[PDB]
C-alpha cells in the first residue's frame, strides 16, 4: 500500500509477472535510474455502453512524457521493462468485465488488402486508439482494420488469453497489475522504429446500469519503466 | 579394399529420414544464444491455459462479441434450460476453434480430461442458483429439471462464489453439459437484471496425443 517511486506516489492494496521472469539488467551502456523510474499516468478513457476496446503501443505512448521522451531522441538504442497498473472505479450498481492483456509484437493488418497502415493510425501519441464493433471499409487508402472480434491481427479474440493477462470483473475485482520483461531477439533495439509491446483492453460483457447512475466508468492506466539502460558516450 | 554389399533401399529419398547431412557453409562461427523469456518445450503447455468458449453462436452473434456471453434474465417460469452443448469431438461444436480445440485438430488420437470454469459476470447485488448437470456418454440428454438433478450435478450459488469449476473426461454420443435454472435472479431496486455468464475451457494435464495429421481449417 502507498508505494512511491521517484517523486510520484500511487495507492494500491495480486500481481501477475510476465513469462515467469523479473525485469533485470544485462560499446558500453549507461544506466539512468533516478529520472526515469516514476509513474507516468496516462490520462483516462471513458467506458460507455456500446464501447469496443482500446489499445496503446508501449514505447510510443511515453514518447512525449517528460525525461523519458528526451532519452528516446538523444540515445539511439535502449531496452526497458514495464510495470502496468490498470484500475477502473465503479460503484456496486454497475456490471461488466474487462480483459487486460499485453501482446508482444502485435503486427496489425491494413483495411486495404494491398497496402500497410500509416504511422498516425497505428499509435496515437499518448492517446488511446479505439476498436470498432463494425467493419472498416475497403475503399479507404490506409487505415487499421479494427473489427474487434478478430482483434485487428486476424486471430480469434477468445484465444487472446495465452499472452500474460488479467481479468477485471466489476463484481469482485477492481484493479489489475502486470509486470513485463524485455522480449526481443537482438539484445538492444531502437525505440522509434519498433514497438515491442501492445497493451489491449477489451470489454467482453458490456457495461450496464439502471436509470439514474452515472453513465460512464473511467479507466486509469499507469506505466512505470523498470531497469532501463541506453547506449552511448 | 574393404568389401561391401549394398542392400535394397539404397539410393532412395525417404521424406521422413534421419541422416547426417553435408553442411553448405562451414567455418561460419554461428551466433550464440540469448536468454529470451517464455520458451515452449512441449505443445501441451499451450493448451493448459484457459480460453473463452463461443457457446452462444446462433447465426447472428458469430460476427460479434456476443458469441461468448450466455444471456441470463429473471423470467417467470421455474425450471428452464440456460444452455446446453454436446461434447461430440469436432462435429461443428463450440469447442472447435478454441485454443484447446485448435491443437487437437492436428492429431488423430487423444484422450484426457477437461477443466470447465464458469464465471458470473453480473452485478454485485444479484443472487440466484444454478444446476450444472453433466450426463455421461450413453445416457440421454435430460429433458427436465428433476431428472437433471438425479444425474451427477453441481449446484452453483451465485451469491457466495462467482466461479464454479467442473472437471470432466473427453475422448475421441459423448456427453452433455446442460445447465438449468434453479431459482430466479433476485435483484434489488435500481439494479439491472439481465446478467451474463462466461465459460472457460482447459486441459486437465494428464492427456496425450498421437499420430499427427494436417488441419482441416484451411482451403
Amino acid at each position: 500500500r502507498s508505494i512511491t517511486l521517484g517523486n510520484s506516489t500511487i495507492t494500491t492494496q495480486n500481481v501477475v509477472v510476465g513469462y515467469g521472469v523479473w525485469p533485470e539488467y544485462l560499446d558500453q551502456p549507461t544506466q539512468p535510474d533516478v529520472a526515469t523510474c516514476r509513474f507516468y499516468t496516462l490520462e483516462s478513457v471513458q467506458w460507455m455502453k456500446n464501447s469496443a476496446g482500446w489499445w496503446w503501443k508501449l514505447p510510443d505512448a511515453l514518447s512525449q512524457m517528460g525525461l523519458f521522451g528526451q532519452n528516446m531522441q538523444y540515445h539511439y538504442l535502449g531496452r526497458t521493462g514495464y510495470t502496468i497498473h490498470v484500475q477502473c472505479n465503479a460503484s456496486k450498481f454497475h456490471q461488466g468485465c474487462l480483459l487486460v492483456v499485453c501482446v508482444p509484437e502485435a503486427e496489425m493488418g491494413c483495411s486495404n488488402l494491398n497496402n500497410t497502415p500509416e504511422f498516425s493510425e497505428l499509435s496515437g501519441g499518448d492517446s488511446a486508439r479505439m476498436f470498432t464493433d463494425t467493419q472498416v471499409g475497403e475503399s479507404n487508402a490506409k487505415k487499421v482494420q479494427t473489427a474487434v472480434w478478430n482483434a485487428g491481427m486476424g486471430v480469434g479474440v477468445g484465444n487472446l488469453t495465452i499472452f500474460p493477462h488479467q481479468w477485471i470483473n466489476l463484481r469482485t475485482n477492481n484493479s489489475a497489475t502486470l509486470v513485463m520483461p524485455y522480449i526481443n531477439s537482438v539484445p538492444m533495439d531502437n525505440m522509434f522504429r519498433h514497438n515491442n509491446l501492445t497493451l489491449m483492453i477489451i470489454p467482453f460483457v458490456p457495461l450496464n446500469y439502471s436509470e439514474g447512475s452515472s453513465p460512464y466508468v473511467p479507466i486509469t492506466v499507469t506505466i512505470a519503466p523498470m531497469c532501463a539502460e541506453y547506449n552511448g558516450l | 579394399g574393404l568389401p561391401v554389399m549394398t542392400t535394397p533401399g539404397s539410393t532412395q529419398f525417404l521424406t521422413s529420414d534421419d541422416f547426417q547431412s553435408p553442411s553448405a557453409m562451414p567455418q561460419f562461427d554461428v551466433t550464440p544464444e540469448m536468454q529470451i523469456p517464455g520458451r515452449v518445450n512441449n505443445l501441451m503447455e499451450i493448451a493448459e491455459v484457459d480460453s473463452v468458449v463461443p457457446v452462444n453462436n446462433t447465426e447472428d452473434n458469430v460476427s460479434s462479441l456476443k458469441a461468448y456471453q450466455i444471456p441470463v434474465q429473471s423470467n417467470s417460469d421455474n425450471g428452464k434450460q440456460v444452455f446446453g452443448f454436446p461434447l461430440q469431438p469436432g462435429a461443428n461444436n463450440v469447442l472447435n476453434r478454441t485454443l484447446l480445440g485448435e491443437i487437437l485438430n492436428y492429431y488423430t488420437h487423444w484422450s484426457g480430461s477437461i477443466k470447465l470454469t464458469f464465471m458470473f459476470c453480473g452485478s454485485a447485488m444479484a443472487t440466484g442458483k444454478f444446476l450444472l448437470a453433466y450426463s455421461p456418454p450413453g445416457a440421454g440428454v435430460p429433458k427436465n429439471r428433476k431428472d437433471a438433478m438425479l444425474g451427477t450435478h453441481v449446484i452453483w450459488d451465485v451469491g457466495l462464489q462467482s466461479s464454479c469449476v467442473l472437471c470432466v473426461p473427453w475422448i475421441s454420443a459423448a456427453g452433455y453439459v446442460t445447465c438449468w435454472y434453479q431459482t430466479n435472479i433476485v435483484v434489488p431496486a435500481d439494479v439491472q437484471s439481465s446478467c451474463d455468464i462466461l465459460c472457460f475451457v482447459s486441459a486437465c494435464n494428464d492427456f496425450s496425443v498421437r499420430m499427427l495429421k494436417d488441419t482441416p481449417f484451411i482451403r
Epitope: 456500446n50 470498432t132 464493433d133 463494425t134 475503399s139 458490456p206 | 447472428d60 460479434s64
Partner: antibody, heavy 124, light 107 residues
Amino acid sequence: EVKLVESGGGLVQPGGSLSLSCAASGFTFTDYYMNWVRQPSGKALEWLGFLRNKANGYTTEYSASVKGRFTISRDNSQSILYLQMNALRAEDSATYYCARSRYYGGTYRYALDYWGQGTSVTVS
Amino acid sequence: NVLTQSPPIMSASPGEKVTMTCRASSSVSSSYLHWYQQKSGASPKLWIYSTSNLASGVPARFSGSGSGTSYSLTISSVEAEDAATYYCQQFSGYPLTFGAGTKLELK
C-alpha cells in the same frame, strides 16, 4: 418518438457546391449511427455513407463512387447532421433522405429504421 | 454484389396468397438481409429485419424466409393497404446495395 427533418435542398449549377442539413429530435443523438440514402426519380435506392456514434470515435465510411466528393459530419453543440457536397455532376439530381440505425440485440445489424421526410436537390 | 428481385411487376387480388423473391449473386449471410416498403410518394419504412423477424407496428400477415443466396417474402392474405413497392437490402462487403424493387398492384 423519433422525429427527423432535413432541409437545404434546391437548385444548383453543375460544378458547384451545396450543403444539406438534417435535424434530429426525440432521442439521444450521440448513440445511433446516422446514414444518408439518396434516390433518383422513381428508381432504385443508393447508399452514400454513415457516421458512427460517440462510443466508436465519430468516424465515417463513405461509398465508393462519392469518396472524396461528399463529406459527412455532425455538430458538437446541438443535435444536427451535415452533408457537404462538392463538384456536382448531372447524375446527382435525386431525393436525399436521412436515416437512423439501431442495435437490435447487442449486435449491429445493418438495418435503417427511422427515415426522414426527404429533401430534393436538382442540378441543371 | 448485386440483388435481383423477381418479378418487377406483380398483381394480386384481395384474399389470395402471394410471394416475391430476392436473389443475390454471391452468398449473403442470413442476419444481414432486410426488407423495406415504400408507398407512393412517401418515405420508406423498415418491414422485416434479419430475414425472418417482424418490425414494430407491422401486421402479422407478412413472413420472410429463405437462406443461402435466395430469399423470399410471402404475404398470407392480401389486403387493401399493402399495395406498394418492396426492396431488399444486403451486406456482404461495402457498400450496402439495395434491390431493384417489386411493385404490388391490387386487382
